[PDB]
Amino acid sequence: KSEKFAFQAEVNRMMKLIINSLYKNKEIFLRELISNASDALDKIRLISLTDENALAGNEELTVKIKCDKEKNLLHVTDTGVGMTREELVKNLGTIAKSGTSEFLNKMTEAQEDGQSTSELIGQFGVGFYSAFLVADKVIVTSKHNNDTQHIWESDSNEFSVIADPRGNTLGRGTTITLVLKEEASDYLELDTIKNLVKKYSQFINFPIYVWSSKTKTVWDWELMN
Ligand SMILES: C[C@@H]1C[C@H]2O[C@@H]2CCCCC(=O)CC2C(Cl)C(=O)CC(=O)C2C(=O)O1
């Protein structure tokens, strides 16, 4: 069932521009993933204004982050609109929106003339690729109301998508799972993550939680705002 895809040339070029723009500020990948989560939540929220049963799959509007130090994984899960199988392929593997092309041109000129680029990344919502600054593999699990749950996975050299054999476990939404590089093990530390989530979530309009422990050890979702 697993279908293999090559990234579109432009996406390969875009990944490299992003990586180089944020190379000395890797922590920004988290800000971009939170921003993506927020936007996805805003979208399902707007859809609920016109579709009564829009939230049926998962009545919560949240962003939940968990570290799995013992598995070397960082998970960022939102209960936003999600993506159908076709949207996974299109959004992650091609220059989907008319605007991505715009970002690509603007990014190239800005990078050429020394103008700041981190803002452009956030403006066009193409920050996902910055996850490759800290991860050897990025996995995206998503569930949209119009489709079944699928998994997209990539080490940046190609990507594949398969129907999730685990069924509908998200309800609705998306999980970004990062298999962290050795040099990035710091992001597996709850304290580093909380501090970062807190620094990048005060502006978000949705509640953001991190699976944290107290220690007898108490494990639960801690609100960062
Ligand atoms: C297509 C929808 C909704 C859309 O408004 C957002 C903004 C940016 C999206 C960028 C993407 O490429 C897909 C998603 C990524 Cl990468 C995430 O980290 C979280 C997420 O929830 C995504 C999504 O489901 O996005």
From Swiss-Prot:
Modified residues (Phosphoserine): S101
Binding site for ATP: N36, D78, N91, F128
Post-translational note: Phosphorylated by CK2.
Superkingdom of the source species: Eukaryota
UniProt subcellular location: Endoplasmic reticulum lumen; Sarcoplasmic reticulum lumen; Melanosome
Positions of glycan attachment: N36, N146
Positions carrying N6-(2-hydroxyisobutyryl)lysine: K97
Tissue/organ expression: Detected in heart muscle (at protein level).
Recorded domain comment: The SRT pseudosubstrate motif associates with STT3A during translation in normal conditions, preventing glycosylation of facultative sites until HSP90B1 folding is completed.
Protein purpose: ATP-dependent chaperone involved in the processing of proteins in the endoplasmic reticulum, regulating their transport. Together with MESD, acts as a modulator of the Wnt pathway by promoting the folding of LRP6, a coreceptor of the canonical Wnt pathway. When associated with CNPY3, required for proper folding of Toll-like receptors. Promotes folding and trafficking of TLR4 to the cell surface.
UniProt family annotation: Belongs to the heat shock protein 90 family.
Record text on subunit structure and interactions: Homodimer; disulfide-linked. Component of an EIF2 complex at least composed of CELF1/CUGBP1, CALR, CALR3, EIF2S1, EIF2S2, HSP90B1 and HSPA5. Part of a large chaperone multiprotein complex comprising DNAJB11, HSP90B1, HSPA5, HYOU, PDIA2, PDIA4, PDIA6, PPIB, SDF2L1, UGGT1 and very small amounts of ERP29, but not, or at very low levels, CALR nor CANX. Interacts with AIMP1; regulates its retention in the endoplasmic reticulum. Hyperglycosylated form interacts with OS9; promoting its degradation by the endoplasmic reticulum associated degradation (ERAD). Interacts with CNPY3.
Annotated protein name in UniProt: Endoplasmin
Primary gene name: HSP90B1
Part of the full-length chain shown: 72 to 337 of 804
